[PDB]
Write an enzyme that holds these catalytic residues in place. Structure first.
Site, PDB file in Angstrom:
ATOM      1  N   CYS A   1       0.838  -1.202   0.000  1.00 34.62           N
ATOM      2  CA  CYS A   1       0.000   0.000   0.000  1.00 34.62           C
ATOM      3  C   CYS A   1       0.860   1.234   0.000  1.00 34.62           C
ATOM      4  O   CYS A   1       1.810   1.312   0.801  1.00 34.62           O
ATOM      5  CB  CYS A   1      -0.791   0.045   1.309  1.00 34.62           C
ATOM      6  SG  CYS A   1      -2.036   1.341   1.358  1.00 34.62           S
TER       7      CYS A   1
ATOM      8  N   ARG B   1      -7.542  -0.942 -23.497  1.00 29.30           N
ATOM      9  CA  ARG B   1      -6.534   0.059 -23.849  1.00 29.30           C
ATOM     10  C   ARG B   1      -6.786   0.579 -25.274  1.00 29.30           C
ATOM     11  O   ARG B   1      -6.337   1.670 -25.650  1.00 29.30           O
ATOM     12  CB  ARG B   1      -5.092  -0.479 -23.641  1.00 29.30           C
ATOM     13  CG  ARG B   1      -4.195   0.437 -22.808  1.00 29.30           C
ATOM     14  CD  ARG B   1      -2.782  -0.103 -22.617  1.00 29.30           C
ATOM     15  NE  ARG B   1      -1.833   0.992 -22.387  1.00 29.30           N
ATOM     16  CZ  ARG B   1      -0.523   0.850 -22.175  1.00 29.30           C
ATOM     17  NH1 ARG B   1       0.039  -0.351 -22.149  1.00 29.30           N
ATOM     18  NH2 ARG B   1       0.230   1.924 -21.984  1.00 29.30           N
TER      19      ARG B   1
HETATM   20  C1  LIG Z   1     -10.388  -2.760  -2.272  1.00 28.34           C
HETATM   21  O1  LIG Z   1      -9.000  -2.901  -1.895  1.00 28.34           O
HETATM   22  C2  LIG Z   1      -8.362  -1.944  -1.128  1.00 28.34           C
HETATM   23  C3  LIG Z   1      -8.587  -1.901   0.348  1.00 28.34           C
HETATM   24  C4  LIG Z   1      -9.488  -2.884   1.059  1.00 28.34           C
HETATM   25  C5  LIG Z   1      -7.888  -0.855   1.121  1.00 28.34           C
HETATM   26  C6  LIG Z   1      -7.021   0.140   0.486  1.00 28.34           C
HETATM   27  C7  LIG Z   1      -6.780   0.120  -0.983  1.00 28.34           C
HETATM   28  O2  LIG Z   1      -5.963   1.045  -1.568  1.00 28.34           O
HETATM   29  C8  LIG Z   1      -7.476  -0.932  -1.798  1.00 28.34           C
HETATM   30  C9  LIG Z   1      -7.269  -1.016  -3.312  1.00 28.34           C
HETATM   31  C10 LIG Z   1      -7.870   0.128  -4.098  1.00 28.34           C
HETATM   32  C11 LIG Z   1      -8.774  -0.076  -5.083  1.00 28.34           C
HETATM   33  C12 LIG Z   1      -9.262  -1.458  -5.471  1.00 28.34           C
HETATM   34  C13 LIG Z   1      -9.314   1.145  -5.796  1.00 28.34           C
HETATM   35  C14 LIG Z   1     -10.849   1.145  -5.812  1.00 28.34           C
HETATM   36  C15 LIG Z   1     -11.464   1.817  -4.597  1.00 28.34           C
HETATM   37  O3  LIG Z   1     -11.481   1.172  -3.535  1.00 28.34           O
HETATM   38  O4  LIG Z   1     -11.961   2.969  -4.712  1.00 28.34           O
HETATM   39  C16 LIG Z   1      -6.480   0.972   1.617  1.00 28.34           C
HETATM   40  O5  LIG Z   1      -5.632   1.845   1.630  1.00 28.34           O
HETATM   41  O6  LIG Z   1      -7.043   0.481   2.851  1.00 28.34           O
HETATM   42  C17 LIG Z   1      -7.956  -0.615   2.615  1.00 28.34           C
HETATM   43  O1  LIG Z   2      -3.262  -1.361  -3.981  1.00 31.56           O
HETATM   44  C1  LIG Z   2      -3.546  -1.335  -2.756  1.00 31.56           C
HETATM   45  N1  LIG Z   2      -3.367  -0.202  -2.045  1.00 31.56           N
HETATM   46  C2  LIG Z   2      -3.633  -0.209  -0.733  1.00 31.56           C
HETATM   47  N2  LIG Z   2      -4.133  -1.289  -0.086  1.00 31.56           N
HETATM   48  C3  LIG Z   2      -4.353  -2.409  -0.779  1.00 31.56           C
HETATM   49  C4  LIG Z   2      -4.098  -2.454  -2.123  1.00 31.56           C
HETATM   50  N3  LIG Z   2      -4.441  -3.691  -2.531  1.00 31.56           N
HETATM   51  C5  LIG Z   2      -4.862  -4.381  -1.462  1.00 31.56           C
HETATM   52  N4  LIG Z   2      -4.815  -3.574  -0.411  1.00 31.56           N
HETATM   53  C6  LIG Z   2      -5.170  -3.865   0.970  1.00 31.56           C
HETATM   54  O2  LIG Z   2      -3.972  -4.462   1.538  1.00 31.56           O
HETATM   55  C7  LIG Z   2      -4.328  -5.731   2.119  1.00 31.56           C
HETATM   56  C8  LIG Z   2      -3.228  -6.779   2.134  1.00 31.56           C
HETATM   57  O3  LIG Z   2      -2.207  -6.343   3.042  1.00 31.56           O
HETATM   58  P1  LIG Z   2      -0.950  -7.261   3.371  1.00 31.56           P
HETATM   59  O4  LIG Z   2      -1.294  -8.534   4.103  1.00 31.56           O
HETATM   60  O5  LIG Z   2      -0.134  -6.449   4.460  1.00 31.56           O
HETATM   61  O6  LIG Z   2      -0.193  -7.668   2.043  1.00 31.56           O
HETATM   62  C9  LIG Z   2      -5.574  -6.163   1.306  1.00 31.56           C
HETATM   63  O7  LIG Z   2      -6.341  -7.118   2.079  1.00 31.56           O
HETATM   64  C10 LIG Z   2      -6.323  -4.873   1.077  1.00 31.56           C
HETATM   65  O8  LIG Z   2      -6.811  -4.424   2.367  1.00 31.56           O
HETATM   66  K   LIG Z   3       1.736   0.629   3.577  1.00 31.65           K
END
Ligand SMILES: COc1c(C)c2c(c(O)c1C/C=C(\C)CCC(=O)O)C(=O)OC2
Ligand SMILES: O=c1[nH]cnc2c1ncn2[C@@H]1O[C@H](COP(=O)(O)O)[C@@H](O)[C@H]1O
Ligand SMILES: [K+]
Ligand SMILES: COc1c(C)c2c(c(O)c1C/C=C(\C)CCC(=O)O)C(=O)OC2
Ligand SMILES: COc1c(C)c2c(c(O)c1C/C=C(\C)CCC(=O)O)C(=O)OC2
Ligand SMILES: O=c1[nH]cnc2c1ncn2[C@@H]1O[C@H](COP(=O)(O)O)[C@@H](O)[C@H]1O
Ligand SMILES: O=c1[nH]cnc2c1ncn2[C@@H]1O[C@H](COP(=O)(O)O)[C@@H](O)[C@H]1O
Ligand SMILES: O=c1[nH]cnc2c1ncn2[C@@H]1O[C@H](COP(=O)(O)O)[C@@H](O)[C@H]1O
Ligand SMILES: [K+]
Ligand SMILES: [K+]
Ligand SMILES: [K+]
Lengths: 467, 467, 467, 467
Positions: free
Chosen positions: C291, C387
């Site tokens: 993230c 795309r």
């Molecule tokens: C849904 O997956 C996540 C979750 C759970 C979290 C974060 C995140 O960036 C994504 C991916 C971001 C996506 C799919 C963009 C679409 C949107 O959700 O508008 C985060 O920072 O905390 C929780």
């Molecule tokens: O692209 C992203 N940006 C921020 N959070 C994400 C993204 N994709 C998934 N996540 C969140 O990050 C979690 C996984 O965290 P991890 O176990 O620390 O790898 C997922 O369950 C989502 O909550």
């Molecule tokens: K992070």
């Protein structure tokens, strides 16, 4: 339950606050006090270490406005000679000379039949018995006459004893003698260093360290007799009874001698030193670059808190505090002062300058000098021994031995560092060292605040002289 | 909302404060208590680990004033033999000897017709039946006579049973026998180790670990019967009912046995151990160098807070605390004591010494030894198995396996480390271990304070023996 | 002045406290709740990410006691097919078969004139019209007869519709048919996975994600129709009106559907989700390994505080909290639970296992798999585009794309991680997940406390399976 | 005792809290105020540095919605010319042209006997005296006639003075003249940049810096006369009397001129600037990437606290705060705004873009540009000297010289960064910059919280455009 006083702070935990200012860096006033009666032109003294301060650096530092402290890792006469050297430092000429037994032919051999000022006449060793001038000889034909039948005799010479003399010259060339009428040179009617730290008679100030062990009396006596301006009784533990006793005895024996005692890191310690009779409290237990005390023993106090606590007491008696150890950048000097110190004592900052002892070392094609704790094995092994005598009883060091990058000349380092002080005084609106020391304010910062303070997020391409 | 007690602290969060002192490092008194009734000459015990303590190190440590704890990763008789070895350690001579059946010619073959003291006479195996002297033989011509018709008979010998005997010698050579009159050597009328930790009869003290699982009774019995001075019931969880039960049972079975119980990290845990009957509380959940408990399980308490909390209770019952794990430098020992501990238990600090088990390993042209958690896979795999028997049920380790730099002899390490303690006692004005433990004060420091404590801003050129 | 609530905390700022315990790791009870009505055997769910969870991993996880969440980065029918796959997962045999038109000679060609069980008879495609047995043929001479004039007819077969059937078998071989009497295999009268997470009918549980954008109705409908056990409406902003609206609508349309909503990081956010109708609150804004939200946007809440704040509310309604993101070691799972969560959702911990999507990659002679944020460019570019359609309006990613070390089989990872949980439950004396979640206590630690927690001051020689 | 206000905070010590939101990133409103009367379309201004902002970047930034500040390290006319350039920026055509003395043959030489629009007729230098068209010539046989006897005379031309003109065209081609009827081009009846920051007459806005030293009057005058929209009086010490005086004088001389004053880092400093007459307070003492002030001088205030303190006062007078320095990622912009700033001033973030001054440098096969402190030696050496004039008085720099990675076009950088702002506004439910600035909440985090915020525990395989 756990016996713990509040969080103690060091240089990197704090930043000074900018304030309203009518002060420009170049108008800032750097003068401060080393002890109750000795003024500094700059708030720096040099550490008493065999890798920082001997006569060479002491003289260079005093010329810039500070005071050097000659280290004690040498014999009494050695140390007294070092002090003396600093006290007599002048920069006299030392002319060509003849014997009362030498003939006119000898003289004409030297002059080459074209005019000359004159030749001071000297005995077997090394008495001055007259002069022979280009006008004593111009019309002496007899090349066989000895210089003594034609010289201007002893009493027509104008002379001074070694040690401004420019007052007596009011006559324009004067012959320097000693107590046995023995020639030492000549001075001929002619300010490079206006910030020089000097005593009431215009001699450069110097300090010298003795340490606290019993039996230092002979050393102290010789240092006072060599004209030392300030005696430092330096110890890794200024709150030890031994140290306080030694300070008491020295105070009683030389009631007018300015004495620095330390090191301490607490209110109580600063109090006990003042009670013992010091003219200044030196602060720092463990913050030194080369120090391992904190790790070896577990004891220490972060230096900004150590300063403020010692100054809290020392202020009530008009006694200056010296912040000793842990100064790495010129911003630390600003901080140590604002915490309550009147000046800072530095080792590594001066170590590796041309003037510090030791020769330059090359290591992977780069220039260094030796810098070592006075409590490292190497510094301590010059103990009193010769190892012939010395040896389940090995020393346990609280200092390391190392190398420090070559810095060049002390003068440029001081100018770099005082630049940064001056700029802080402008930023904080402190006209004098006193105002910084008593009125400037801190904020406390996190580790993240300290990273923002440094250079960050760019590649440095050139080394800046203060960073 | 979040269920959180105050900030817990570890060694690097604190520094001790210097204080008024009439104490010199070499006058500091290192004596302290291991348990309510067992005195140490130095506040160190060695960990009960198969890579730290077997007889070899236990003996070396006791000679220096501490106590070693033999580990349990071996059979009962193996462990009892180790304890016994320590208990009987002496440094006897073991002379040349003959048979009652051997002839005078046999003897003259050995002596070479020039004078001799004598030969103790022994049976088939291994009974002592007399002596034959340089004066029994000087005038025996008949080279055919058997040693037994000319020997000094059984009753004219002066002897002792194995186990000071120097009292009975008041006669100057004495023959050591056992219960079947079997020869074991000779001792001939002749202090290297004055700080030795010894029992009321002048034998070196030793401890031994058993752990808390059911079925330890046989092991305990054999260890007590081998003369163990102190039993350690060691567990990763001293606050577990299992452990408390095991301690209760052992207390009831050996009401005079000094028992160490642990590990705990709380007031409550120290209380429940005392209630169970321990003579000492061992503190540390997760601080060990080789420990992964905190990461694997999420559980732990920073060790300075764990010590003070356990000591807060244990002090009220006169019960000493042992600080176990996380000691890296001698300054940590000072800190663990000031936090309330009577001594420290160490692994890595002693691991890699000559005396610790295992051979030296070379790895990239440098000297190491094995050091591993007692909860690592390798330490645990010597389980009870042979892997022939053992195998979705794999063990989950809370320790790692590693290597530690070769340290040389234990004696020099101890001297290095106690040097640093002694110096802290001088700095804090603590005459005895008790004064450090009950009167010394801490300050809390930031990460920046800890960086100032270390060496900083210089290149170390030589390794210091305590750093 | 600065608008700031108290210090928020993450996993490394805290440690759990050991307590009195009658719990052994292997007696610890791992069962917990995913939602108000769905039980887990282990407190783990897998992230809904195209690099973590498709049918393969969902099945493997459910077999071990958790629930996988199929990701939404695929078509509706694709996603429904994945769910269906999990729901029907069995491990049936699929025997050799003949046609009603094939002759006895064809059969004898296959059997090789030695006895046989029988051959199920099938039509052009793919109707089941009877059976021919080793006893239907043993005495049929005419090799020209078609299988249909000698087969056992349709009605003498014993059959079942796809989807325990072992009840109807009470006959020992049964032919699996579908709704058009079409053959699908055979099952012949014969527990590998006792911790399996299963629904009331003994099928493996599965979840599936849809996200919060408008127009998800068709997807939800198909997932419910494919037998999904729990619907996750996953968003980077659960406190957004859009998300709350979508949850409201889904609740109203499927009043019995278990729905997970999130993510939030506050009391308020957890409250608004509960009000919208969720059966569980998913917590985590920014703590995920991949993230970049916190850096890109500046928004986030340290995960231990985010959990406790969300649980403070969710507890008052009996609603479980799921701790999602930032779990790196098994000790983080312990901590997330003690902070108030009923289970943890993990990505990186499961990514790179055999079962996760994608193939193994070699990079410098070492094994990895792809792992990427669902908000990275690559994950988002599978947008809805090709795309061809898509392009001053480029996406701004809040996730990165990377690689993660190959882990092997999911089962071993789970066992490693739950080992560490079990051990913490023994250390904290928590019999059930509820007791850890509601009664365990934390201490707050410094950065120095966290360094003591790790391995320190030794060289790791072998990799431990949980570290 | 130690004079210390509370803990000051910087960007990495805080995170914003998500809140209820009806805001989508792409509906977020980015408009804000630079000064009391000048609106920005995006909350960014570019630093006044010789390695960040000259006309090139000022124009590119204004086209995107911000304002560039031309640096002062150039002559007055140089600086005024830069401002002027920005003010007149248009993207006119500049047609082919003939002389009144040139013959019809000359014309036919150019046209090539096929039809043409026309040729504007010009004098020796450079007066416009008419036009000759494809219809003036089609039927002129005499190739010898001069263009002037057949041209359309001066008065039949349709013209405009340089400086929308599209109003006067209501005729479709118009000739641009100046005050001496001298031709400058042509514009022929034909929005790329809708977010452009523009003045009441539709010209791009520009700022320019002068600094606080005496004698700036001539420079200010020329900048105002060149149409500068906003004057920045930039200093390393805005709380210095010198600076306040200079601001007072400028306010009195140009009562309608928008003036930015700074930098300060305190309530008091912001107060004294407002009293002096600024239209905006610029905040930051020491947080800049290339800044060494904090280290050299020891002075500074962590930037989030500096912002909030300055905004606490500035809010009471309706005066906007500019957060200047230390912005590294787009999440810092969000934070600086929520702390009270109306926009951010950036150096490194824009340095190294195509548009910034200087050429691309290759260093180890990678693309960079120069970026240096305005207080570094190199920036300062362009002093006023030529080094011929300049030289124990060397400058003491508070900035370093370095290189920064090539970023490409400014437009894409801005879009990347504002993406992250927009997303934060959605996360925090802030419709406008004002709502973020006045209603968003922070939490304070530890160093461990900041590590969780970053990417952690995965290998990044591709660089993300905002990270
Ligand atoms: C849904 O997956 C996540 C979750 C759970 C979290 C974060 C995140 O960036 C994504 C991916 C971001 C996506 C799919 C963009 C679409 C949107 O959700 O508008 C985060 O920072 O905390 C929780
Ligand atoms: O692209 C992203 N940006 C921020 N959070 C994400 C993204 N994709 C998934 N996540 C969140 O990050 C979690 C996984 O965290 P991890 O176990 O620390 O790898 C997922 O369950 C989502 O909550
Ligand atoms: K992070
Ligand atoms: C005297 O020089 C110092 C000083 C000032 C300090 C320390 C130190 O270790 C030494 C060297 C230690 C020596 C020479 C051993 C002799 C002794 O002093 O007993 C320290 O930790 O704080 C201050
Ligand atoms: C003007 O540019 C700055 C600003 C805005 C700041 C600092 C700084 O060092 C310089 C460059 C320093 C210069 C040009 C020296 C001239 C002087 O200003 O006297 C700082 O630390 O906070 C803010
Ligand atoms: O060996 C040592 N151990 C600890 N402190 C020392 C030792 N030698 C000198 N010092 C102290 O350290 C100071 C120098 O610190 P520095 O400027 O940070 O290099 C000296 O002035 C003494 O106070
Ligand atoms: O495998 C293990 N896991 C955790 N702690 C252990 C393990 N083995 C030994 N210990 C503890 O760690 C201590 C040694 O810590 P050290 O001195 O820091 O190396 C031992 O005395 C035991 O308390
Ligand atoms: O030489 C310098 N020393 C200190 N600050 C500087 C110097 N030059 C510019 N600055 C400040 O640093 C800011 C740029 O910070 P940056 O965005 O973090 O690169 C400028 O806008 C000025 O405030
Ligand atoms: K140090
Ligand atoms: K550990
Ligand atoms: K900086």
């Amino acid at each position: 339950m756990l016996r713990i006083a509040k969080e103690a702070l060091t240089f990197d935990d704090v930043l000074l606050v900018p304030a309203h200012s009518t002060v420009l860096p170049n108008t800032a006033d750097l003068r401060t006090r080393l002890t109750k009666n000795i003024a500094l032109n700059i708030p720096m003294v040099s550490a008493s270490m065999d890798t920082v301060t001997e006569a060479r650096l002491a003289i260079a530092l005093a010329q810039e406005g500070g005071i050097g402290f000659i280290h004690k890792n040498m014999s009494i006469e050695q140390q007294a000679a070092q002090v003396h050297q600093v006290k007599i430092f002048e920069a006299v000429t030392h002319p060509v000379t003849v014997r009362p037994e030498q003939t006119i032919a000898d003289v004409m051999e030297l002059t080459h039949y074209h005019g000359f000022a004159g030749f001071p006449v000297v005995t077997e060793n090394n008495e001055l018995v007259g002069i022979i001038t280009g006008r004593d000889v111009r019309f002496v034909t007899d090349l066989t006459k000895s210089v003594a039948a034609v010289m201007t005799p002893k009493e027509r010479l104008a002379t001074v004893k070694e040690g401004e003399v420019q007052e007596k010259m009011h006559v324009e060339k004067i012959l320097v003698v000693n107590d046995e009428f023995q020639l030492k040179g000549m001075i001929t009617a002619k300010e490079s260093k206006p910030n020089a730290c000097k005593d009431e008679q215009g001699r450069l100030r110097v300090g010298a360290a003795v340490g606290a062990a019993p039996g230092n009396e002979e050393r102290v006596k010789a240092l006072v007799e060599a004209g030392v301006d300030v005696l430092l009784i330096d110890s890794s533990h200024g709150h030890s009874e031994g140290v306080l006793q030694r300070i008491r005895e020295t105070r009683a024996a030389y009631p007018h001698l300015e004495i620095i005692g330390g090191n301490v890191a607490t209110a109580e310690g600063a109090r006990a030193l003042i009670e013992a009779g010091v003219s200044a409290v030196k602060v720092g237990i463990g913050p030194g670059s080369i120090c391992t005390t904190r790790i070896v023993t577990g004891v220490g106090v972060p230096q900004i808190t150590a300063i403020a606590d010692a100054a809290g007491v020392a202020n009530e008696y008009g006694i200056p505090v010296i912040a000793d150890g842990g100064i790495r950048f010129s911003g630390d000097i600003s901080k140590a002062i604002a915490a309550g110190a009147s000046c800072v004592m530095v080792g590594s900052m001066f170590a590796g300058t041309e003037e510090a002892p030791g020769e330059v070392i090359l290591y992977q094609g780069r220039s260094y000098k030796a810098y070592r704790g006075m409590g490292s094995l190497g510094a301590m092994s010059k103990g009193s021994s010769d190892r012939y005598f010395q040896t389940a009883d090995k020393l346990v060091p609280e200092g390391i031995e190392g190398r420090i990058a070559y810095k060049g000349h002390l003068k440029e380092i001081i100018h770099q560092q005082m630049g940064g002080l001056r700029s802080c005084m402008g930023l904080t609106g402190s006209a004098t060292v006193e105002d910084l020391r008593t009125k400037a304010q801190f904020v406390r910062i996190s580790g993240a605040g300290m990273k923002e303070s440094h250079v960050h997020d760019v590649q440095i391409t050139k080394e800046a002289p203060n960073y």
